[PDB]
Design a protein around this ligand. Sequence first.
Ligand SMILES: Nc1ncnc2c1ncn2[C@@H]1O[C@H](COP(=O)(O)OP(=O)(O)OC[C@H]2O[C@@H](O)[C@H](O)[C@@H]2O)[C@@H](O)[C@H]1O
Length: 160
Amino acid sequence: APSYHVVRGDIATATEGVIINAANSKGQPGGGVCGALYKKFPESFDLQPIEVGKARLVKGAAKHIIHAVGPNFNKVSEVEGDKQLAEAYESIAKIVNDNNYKSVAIPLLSTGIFSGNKDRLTQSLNHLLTALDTTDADVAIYCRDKKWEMTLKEAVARRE
Ligand SMILES: Nc1ncnc2c1ncn2[C@@H]1O[C@H](COP(=O)(O)OP(=O)(O)OC[C@H]2O[C@@H](O)[C@H](O)[C@@H]2O)[C@@H](O)[C@H]1O
């Protein structure tokens, strides 16, 4: 194991430049993080349809970016959506192992508006961590606000 750590900043400025997007399974995009990555990595996206909880690793004019399906959690069951939120991180962890991504800038998956329209940060960190229990990659885990920042440590402080 390396380390895993909460970082208050922007993922669309991360040095690793391996980043995740909240794609939907249609490939059709839109978002905060997603529209910040467009201001870093336009010549870097292939926008395909993707399977639910799966990914597409894209190669571009400076870095490689991973599109992944964050399902809208108001459409799925909680125990089922929780199974898909493990799978979405596990199916990413496979790719972070295979393509040898020894450090990565990783966001939250579909935990905000794309949840049940409400914040599930700590449950999404448990699933980020539960996919990473079978990995040896170092983890820049981003946030914007100091309550959300404190929530990502609070989620690690349920597994310390
Ligand atoms: N640039 C950023 N870098 C890292 N983390 C960020 C960033 N901007 C926002 N976040 C964090 O992610 C959460 C917000 O996610 P989005 O930015 O909205 O993620 P995105 O992939 O773009 O989701 C798109 C969905 O949300 C809305 O932006 C939009 O309506 C769309 O339905 C917050 O908890 C915040 O801490």
